[PDB]
Design a protein around this motif. Structure first.
Motif, mmCIF file in Angstrom:
data_model
loop_
_atom_site.group_PDB
_atom_site.id
_atom_site.type_symbol
_atom_site.label_atom_id
_atom_site.label_comp_id
_atom_site.label_asym_id
_atom_site.label_seq_id
_atom_site.Cartn_x
_atom_site.Cartn_y
_atom_site.Cartn_z
ATOM 1 N N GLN C 1 5.298 -6.634 1.599
ATOM 2 C CA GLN C 1 3.879 -6.566 1.942
ATOM 3 C C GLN C 1 3.659 -5.705 3.182
ATOM 4 O O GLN C 1 2.673 -4.957 3.268
ATOM 5 N N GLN C 2 4.550 -5.823 4.169
ATOM 6 C CA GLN C 2 4.427 -4.989 5.364
ATOM 7 C C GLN C 2 4.515 -3.514 5.007
ATOM 8 O O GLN C 2 3.692 -2.696 5.449
ATOM 9 N N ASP C 3 5.505 -3.155 4.197
ATOM 10 C CA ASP C 3 5.620 -1.765 3.787
ATOM 11 C C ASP C 3 4.416 -1.352 2.954
ATOM 12 O O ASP C 3 4.038 -0.179 2.936
ATOM 13 N N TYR C 4 3.788 -2.311 2.275
ATOM 14 C CA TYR C 4 2.643 -1.997 1.430
ATOM 15 C C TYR C 4 1.430 -1.630 2.258
ATOM 16 O O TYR C 4 0.734 -0.656 1.959
ATOM 17 N N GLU C 5 1.154 -2.415 3.291
ATOM 18 C CA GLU C 5 0.078 -2.052 4.205
ATOM 19 C C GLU C 5 0.380 -0.726 4.900
ATOM 20 O O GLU C 5 -0.517 0.111 5.085
ATOM 21 N N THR C 6 1.646 -0.506 5.272
ATOM 22 C CA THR C 6 2.026 0.791 5.825
ATOM 23 C C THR C 6 1.688 1.919 4.857
ATOM 24 O O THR C 6 1.118 2.947 5.249
ATOM 25 N N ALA C 7 2.048 1.745 3.587
ATOM 26 C CA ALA C 7 1.766 2.755 2.577
ATOM 27 C C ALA C 7 0.270 2.954 2.415
ATOM 28 O O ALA C 7 -0.196 4.070 2.174
ATOM 29 N N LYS C 8 -0.500 1.872 2.500
ATOM 30 C CA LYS C 8 -1.949 1.999 2.434
ATOM 31 C C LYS C 8 -2.449 2.916 3.536
ATOM 32 O O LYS C 8 -3.283 3.799 3.303
ATOM 33 N N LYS D 54 1.052 15.401 -2.170
ATOM 34 C CA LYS D 54 1.498 14.342 -1.266
ATOM 35 C C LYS D 54 0.681 13.073 -1.469
ATOM 36 O O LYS D 54 1.232 11.970 -1.576
ATOM 37 N N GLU D 55 -0.643 13.214 -1.503
ATOM 38 C CA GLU D 55 -1.514 12.073 -1.725
ATOM 39 C C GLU D 55 -1.241 11.459 -3.085
ATOM 40 O O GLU D 55 -1.307 10.239 -3.250
ATOM 41 N N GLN D 56 -0.936 12.295 -4.074
ATOM 42 C CA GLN D 56 -0.511 11.781 -5.365
ATOM 43 C C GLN D 56 0.695 10.880 -5.194
ATOM 44 O O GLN D 56 0.614 9.664 -5.405
ATOM 45 N N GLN D 57 1.781 11.443 -4.668
ATOM 46 C CA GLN D 57 3.021 10.694 -4.532
ATOM 47 C C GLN D 57 2.764 9.379 -3.825
ATOM 48 O O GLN D 57 3.287 8.335 -4.225
ATOM 49 N N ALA D 64 2.827 1.447 -7.744
ATOM 50 C CA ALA D 64 4.005 0.647 -8.034
ATOM 51 C C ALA D 64 4.084 -0.521 -7.071
ATOM 52 O O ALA D 64 4.447 -1.638 -7.455
ATOM 53 N N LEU D 65 3.721 -0.280 -5.814
ATOM 54 C CA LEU D 65 3.781 -1.333 -4.815
ATOM 55 C C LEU D 65 2.783 -2.433 -5.157
ATOM 56 O O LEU D 65 3.088 -3.621 -5.060
ATOM 57 N N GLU D 66 1.580 -2.043 -5.576
ATOM 58 C CA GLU D 66 0.552 -3.012 -5.929
ATOM 59 C C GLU D 66 0.995 -3.879 -7.092
ATOM 60 O O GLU D 66 0.783 -5.095 -7.082
ATOM 61 N N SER D 70 1.554 -7.835 -7.102
ATOM 62 C CA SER D 70 0.852 -8.649 -8.083
ATOM 63 C C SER D 70 1.826 -9.548 -8.823
ATOM 64 O O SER D 70 1.522 -10.709 -9.111
ATOM 65 N N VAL D 71 3.003 -9.020 -9.158
ATOM 66 C CA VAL D 71 4.039 -9.853 -9.752
ATOM 67 C C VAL D 71 4.715 -10.725 -8.704
ATOM 68 O O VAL D 71 5.224 -11.802 -9.035
#
Lengths: 148, 99, 99, 98
Positions: C1-8, D54-57, D64-66, D70-71
């Motif tokens: 989750q931390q990396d996810y917010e970072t990615a956001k 870059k924004e695509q990647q 994938a993270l989402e 979610s899982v």
């Protein structure tokens, strides 16, 4: 032999079709050249009218004396007063309005960007969904998503 | 996407209004000498008649542009069907000469 | 989750940068107004500079005209060849059907 | 029209000059926000497609993270059930590899 005869008939028919279509295509090409020539003629007529009008107005408009200039400011002020719901809008207060609407504009851009991020993830999710669906259709043919 | 569509509309409108205020700010200086005045309409009559004639020429020119574009299209499809017929006849002739 | 917010946040950075670049692309022509900026600064008769800019634009416009003409010729050529392939494939499929 | 309508009185010229000022400012702004002083209108399209990639990647990354999150809503029990099943079928294994 009989097959060759059938194909000879087919070739005759194809030759007739080719002749007719070549006729139509030559007609279309010459019509296209016609409409070109006409369009360039009209273009040159327009250019002539503009150039000669410029010639006529040459001495009329050079001597502005920066005295009809401000009227543009008048029309700009009125356009803004209509576009911006600020009947009180005056050149003196226009600066606060400028900074304020700039703030709103950048805020709208930021909200738009957040919407865009969420949209740009949802869309790609949908895209994988659709790519799977297309793969299924290609391999097996028509089917609903629930069957996918 | 509907939401973002609305948001984009809002953003465009805000940007337009902001540019209008930038224009006001710039033209504040021109307002500064709004008292000045100058002569006008020395040669309008012939000018105006000629503007109207030029406008008629504009309209006819636009008409011609439209007919040109559409004709280019129709020519294109006719050419494509001609090429399709060409390929078909050539392939058939190849088959017959092969036989 | 931390990396996810970072990615956001990284996505947000990419979004803002791309949006900027887009805006400039929209203003691509506006950079052509540097002459307009210089022209405006004249604050006196400048129809000569207007005519010069007009001539330069005319040259560029004709250059683009030729660019477009050759491009459309190329595209049309490719279209006819594609259509010829289509017709040939259809015909071949038909002879295969017959055999 | 301007030359034939020089009565246009440079209002279009005013707007274009102001537009140039805005365009210069925007170019500057992007050069900072993209940290690309090496930039031009004539190649900004190239960096634009570049950072579109870059924004695509980033977008597929985050997508994938989402889904992974979610899982990840899945409770702890599923993780243990799965790991034990794997350890039975294959034998001892690291959860990072299961």
């Amino acid at each position: 032999q009989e097959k060759i005869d059938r194909y000879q008939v087919d070739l005759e028919e194809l030759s007739y079709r080719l002749e007719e279509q070549t006729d139509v295509v030559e007609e279309a090409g010459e019509l296209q050249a016609e409409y070109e020539a006409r369009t360039e003629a009209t273009e040159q007529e327009v250019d002539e009218l503009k150039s000669q009008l410029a010639d006529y107005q040459q001495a009329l408009d050079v001597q502005q004396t920066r005295a009809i200039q401000y009227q543009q400011a008048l029309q700009a002020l009125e356009r803004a007063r209509e576009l911006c719901r600020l009947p009180d809008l005056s050149v003196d207060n226009a600066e606060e309005w400028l900074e304020t609407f700039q703030a709103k504009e950048q805020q709208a851009t930021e909200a738009l960007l957040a919407l865009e991020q969420k949209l740009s993830v949802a869309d790609a999710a949908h895209n994988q969904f659709e790519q799977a669906y297309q793969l299924v259709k290609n391999i097996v043919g028509e089917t609903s998503r629930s069957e996918a | 996407q509907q939401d973002y569509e609305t948001a984009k509309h809002s953003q465009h409108q805000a940007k337009q209004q902001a540019f209008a205020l930038v224009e006001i700010v710039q033209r504040r200086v021109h307002f500064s000498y709004s008292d000045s005045a100058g002569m006008l309409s020395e040669n309008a009559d012939l000018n105006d008649k000629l503007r109207q004639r030029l406008e008629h020429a504009e309209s006819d020119r636009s008409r011609a542009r439209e007919q040109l574009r559409q004709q280019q299209a129709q020519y294109s499809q006719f050419n494509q069907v001609l090429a399709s017929l060409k390929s078909s006849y050539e392939t058939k002739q190849d088959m017959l000469k092969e036989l």
